[PDB]
Paper text:
BsCspB is a relatively small protein of 67 amino acids length that belongs to the cold shock protein family. Notably, BsCspB shows an overall thermodynamic stability of about ΔG° = 10 kJ mol−1 at T = 298 K and possesses fast unfolding, ku, and refolding, kf, rate constants of about ku = 12 s−1 and kf = 1070 s−1, respectively. In previous work, we have used auxotrophic E. coli strains to incorporate fluorinated phenylalanine (Phe) or tryptophan (Trp) amino acid residues into the Cold shock protein B from Bacillus subtilis (BsCspB). Our findings show that fluorine-labelling of proteins utilizing singly modified amino acids like Phe or Trp does not cause a detectable alteration of thermodynamic and structural properties of BsCspB.
The overall thermodynamic stability determined for 4-19F-Trp-BsCspB is highest comparing all variants probed in the present study and deviates in ΔG° by 1.6 kJ/mol from wild type BsCspB. This property of 4-19F-Trp-BsCspB has been one rationale to elucidate the structural features of this fluorine-labelled variant of BsCspB by using X-ray crystallography in more detail. The fluorescence emission intensity is lowest for 4-19F-Trp-BsCspB among all probed fluorine-labelled protein variants. Secondly, it has been consistently shown by three independent experimental methods that 4-19F-Trp-BsCspB exhibits a small increase in ΔG° by about 1 kJ/mol and in TM by about 4 Kelvin whereas 5-19F-Trp-BsCspB shows a moderate decrease in ΔG° by about 1.5 kJ/mol and a conserved value of TM compared to wild type BsCspB. To investigate potential structural changes in 4-19F-Trp-BsCspB and 4-19F-Phe-BsCspB, we have elucidated their atomic structures using X-ray crystallography to 2.05 Å and 2.1 Å resolution, respectively. The samples crystallized in a closely related crystallographic lattice, containing one single molecular copy of modified BsCspB in the asymmetric unit and sharing a same space group symmetry. The global RMSD for all Cα atoms for the 4-19F-Trp-BsCspB and 4-19F-Phe-BsCspB structures calculated in this work is 0.23 Å, indicating that the fold trace of the two variants is virtually identical. Furthermore, wild type and 19F-derivative structures displayed identical conformational rotamers for the modified Trp and Phe residues, indicating that local structural distortions had also not taken place. Interestingly, these slight changes are independent of the number and sites of fluorine atoms which have been inserted into BsCspB: one fluorine atom used for 19F-Trp labelling (sequence position 8) or seven fluorine atoms used for 19F-Phe labelling (sequence positions 9, 15, 17, 27, 30, 38, and 49).
Numbering used by the authors: 1 to 67
Write the structure that this text describes.
C-alpha cells in the first residue's frame, strides 16, 4: 500500500486529491473510500491506498483513513 495525505476534497461533489511526497498527486473519487459511514474525506487526512490505472489513467483505490 501507499501512504498519503488528503490534499483537498470536495465533500458535496465527492472527489479530490491525495498528496504524496515524491510522486504526483492522486485523484480520489468517493467510491474508492473504504470502511463504514458516509464516504468522504477531509483535507490533511492520513490515508493508505493503492493506485489503479485503466484507460482513464491512474486514480486512488482502496482508500482507508488512518490515525
Amino acid at each position: 500500500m501507499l501512504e498519503g495525505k488528503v490534499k483537498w476534497f470536495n465533500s458535496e461533489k465527492g472527489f479530490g486529491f491525495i498528496e504524496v511526497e515524491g510522486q504526483d498527486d492522486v485523484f480520489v473519487h468517493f467510491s474508492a473510500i473504504q470502511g463504514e459511514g458516509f464516504k468522504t474525506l477531509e483535507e490533511g487526512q492520513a490515508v493508505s491506498f493503492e493506485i489503479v490505472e485503466g484507460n482513464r489513467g491512474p486514480q486512488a483505490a482502496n482508500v482507508t483513513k488512518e490515525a
